Amino acid sequence: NPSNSNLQALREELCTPGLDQGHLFEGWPETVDECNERQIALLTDLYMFSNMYPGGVAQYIRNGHELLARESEEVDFAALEMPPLIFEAPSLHRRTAERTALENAGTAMLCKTVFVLVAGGLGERLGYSSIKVSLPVETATNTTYLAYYLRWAQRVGGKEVPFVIMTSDDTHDRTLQLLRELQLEVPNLHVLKQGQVFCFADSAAHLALDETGKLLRKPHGHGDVHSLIYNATVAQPLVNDWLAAGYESIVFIQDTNAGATITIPISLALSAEHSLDMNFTCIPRVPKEPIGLLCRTKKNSGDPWLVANVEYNVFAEVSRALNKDGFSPFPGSVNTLVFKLSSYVDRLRESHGIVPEFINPKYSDETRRSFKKPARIESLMQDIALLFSEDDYRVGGTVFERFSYQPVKNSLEEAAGLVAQGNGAYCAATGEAAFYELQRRRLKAIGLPLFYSSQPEVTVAKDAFGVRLFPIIVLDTVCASSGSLDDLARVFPTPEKVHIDQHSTLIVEGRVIIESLELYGALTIRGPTDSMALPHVVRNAVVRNAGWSVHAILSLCAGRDSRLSEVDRIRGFVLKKTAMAVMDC
């Protein structure tokens, strides 16, 4: 679009004191016409940034100056204490009256919930070169995180469930590819791609270039999700469509935490019970943990309290300073965010989805602003909490068991180092192991008599630590529906007649009811894919076979070939699916 005249205007503007981007036009002709195609392209690139960032590149640079000055100082709050509105969730593995009440109320609320998945990252830091949502939740079925979230959402919210996936330049095309390949049909899905922002080569906010001579770009953070939604349309605003359709809540989830499908119904139920406009999903926190703390804050002695996440790195600094004169007192936020939709939209409309920003440069050496790598401005999706004043809104946190938090974020190497420090591994191995264990704890809670050893069955990361997998029991969304305890009880109506040996594998797909079963081995039971069809009922079943086993990937891993994939290598073991009985119909 941009005219030759506007590009010249921007070029000159960027050369003025306070912006000082003269280095960009190093060795250029005096007018636009005289400029070549590269040059005209770089200027156009600077120009079009206006349709991507408030105030375009000039304002980006000013914001940079302001933030670089800010982060050179010592962050600190005048006041910091426990959030007033904190609520304890009942255990996920005890079927009490309260848990039943919360799950059923929360599950009803899922019918009027909008879901948002932030998935703008690759899993390279894990040793995985593909998109994180293509990681399998477990390798028994190999169900991807993407399919896991979407099928659950379509199960609890119906086929036409409103669903947003935020992607980035890194993940976007592969996300679309995965959607297509999995044959997922989600009529009201919106894939919204965040744009990358320019980078600063130095502490004076001079823009960085790559080797090609083009402007360097990096992600602006998960904070982008709110503005992407604010600007999205179907042509009325996206959120208008949701409100008018009767939707009442909106939930934000991250890319590799399968626990969200359990915590969410409870958070919704509690949000309603306690009239919460924003509800942070939390867990008891360990002092050495890369998750934020939910705190009541007063930035300056003048301001009103604000309930907000204080990122781990920042609380590592504020903590160490001042006071007015075995977990953290304050909850750890896992970034499953639950909102009342009307309140969310109000704040969204007011802010245009813009949340406070920050910059966090990595320095070449200890104490001079020579960047090790170019820095850019970032934002966090949870910082939208800062737009909810205590006067007008109720922002709180729900505390769940730590076990319900199951992210896959660390490589095997990192996990080994973390485990040595007594910290959580949060790697692919413990993610998969935790998923299987979660199913077992949920099933035992409704009376399924599962007897199994607590000992690890395989060791990973050079014998650093072990996990166990068996017994493996995976029920799909047609079988288990929402996964509530009541829903599980529909699959096992007489659980005391179901005897699954500790070494067994049970995979259930479609409309299945298991009344009685003795299983010593691996079994797949399939029923109708239609949730409304007549169930396949299993009675007096006895199945014995060699079943499955698991073993570690050996250190002697070089080879012309092997069928080990990155997916295998990042968890350090492989299931051997030796035998399998199938009961169809």
Ligand X SMILES: O=c1ccn([C@@H]2O[C@H](COP(=O)(O)OP(=O)(O)O[C@@H]3OC[C@H](O)[C@H](O)[C@H]3O)[C@@H](O)[C@H]2O)c(=O)[nH]1
| Smallest distance, ligand X to C-beta of residue 254, A | 4
247 is in an annotated binding site: no
Tell me if 120 contacts ligand X by CB under 6 A.
Answer: yes
Tell me if 226 contacts ligand X by CB under 6 A.
Answer: no
- The binder of ligand X chosen from 188, 254, 267, 410 (CB under 6 A): 254
Strands 332-340, 292-298: pairing kind: antiparallel
| Smallest distance, ligand X to C-beta of residue 23, A | 27
Closer to ligand X by Cβ: residue 92 or 197? 197
Cα–Cα distances in angstroms (integers) from residue 304 to residues 141, 232, 389, in the given order: 50, 32, 8
Which region among 94-102, 113-121, 135-143, 505-513 touches ligand X (by CB under 6 A)?
113-121
- The binder of ligand X chosen from 21, 113, 143, 168 (CB under 6 A): 168
230 is in an annotated binding site: no
- 155, containing H or E segment: helix 145-157
The DSSP code for 211 is: T
Closer to ligand X by Cβ: residue 132 or 347? 132
Tell me if 267 contacts ligand X by CB under 6 A.
Answer: no
Tell me if 107 contacts ligand X by CB under 6 A.
Answer: no
Neighbours of 223 (CB within 10 A): 23
Question: In the window 384-423, what residues touch ligand X (CB under 6 A)?
Answer: 409
Closer to ligand X by Cβ: residue 409 or 571? 409
Question: In the window 23-62, what residues touch ligand X (CB under 6 A)?
Answer: none
What is the b/e burial string over 388-420, where b = at least 16 CB atoms within 10 angstroms of the residue's CB? beeeebbbbbbbbbbbbbbbbbbbbebbbebbe
Length of the chain: 585
Tell me if 119 contacts ligand X by CB under 6 A.
Answer: yes
**Residue type at 323?**
N
Tell me if 379 contacts ligand X by CB under 6 A.
Answer: no
C-alpha 200/C-alpha 495 separation (Å) is: 61
| Smallest distance, ligand X to C-beta of residue 221, A | 5
C-alpha 151/C-alpha 148 separation (Å) is: 6
311 is in an annotated binding site: yes
C-alpha 208/C-alpha 220 separation (Å) is: 15
Closer to ligand X by Cβ: residue 264 or 491? 264
Breaks (C-N over 2.5 A) in the chain follow: 234, 325
Here's the x/- map for ligand X, 181-220, by CB under 6 A: it reads as -------------x------------------------x-
For residues 365, 367, 370 and 376, what is the CA-based torsion angle, rounded to 10 degrees?
A: 100
Q: Give the start-end residues of each E strand in 48-177.
A: 79-81, 86-88, 113-118, 163-167
444 is in an annotated binding site: no
Here's the x/- map for ligand X, 426-455, by CB under 6 A: it reads as ------------------------------
Question: In the window 315-344, what residues touch ligand X (CB under 6 A)?
Answer: 333-335
Phi then psi dihedrals of residue 520, to 5 deg: -125, 80
Closer to ligand X by Cβ: residue 47 or 426? 426
The number of helix segments (H) and strand segments (E) in the chain equals 16, 28
Alpha helix ranges (H) inside 3-73:
4-13, 37-48, 56-70
C-alpha 277/C-alpha 86 separation (Å) is: 13
| Smallest distance, ligand X to C-beta of residue 400, A | 13
Rg of the chain, C-alpha, whole Å: 26
Closer to ligand X by Cβ: residue 308 or 506? 308
422 is in an annotated binding site: no
Closer to ligand X by Cβ: residue 311 or 457? 311
**Residues at the site binding ligand X, with contacts judged by CB under 6 A:** 118-121, 166, 168, 194, 219, 221-222, 254-255, 291-292, 309, 311, 333-335, 380, 382, 409
Annotated binding-site members: 118, 120-121, 132, 194, 221-222, 254-255, 292, 311-312, 333, 382, 405, 409
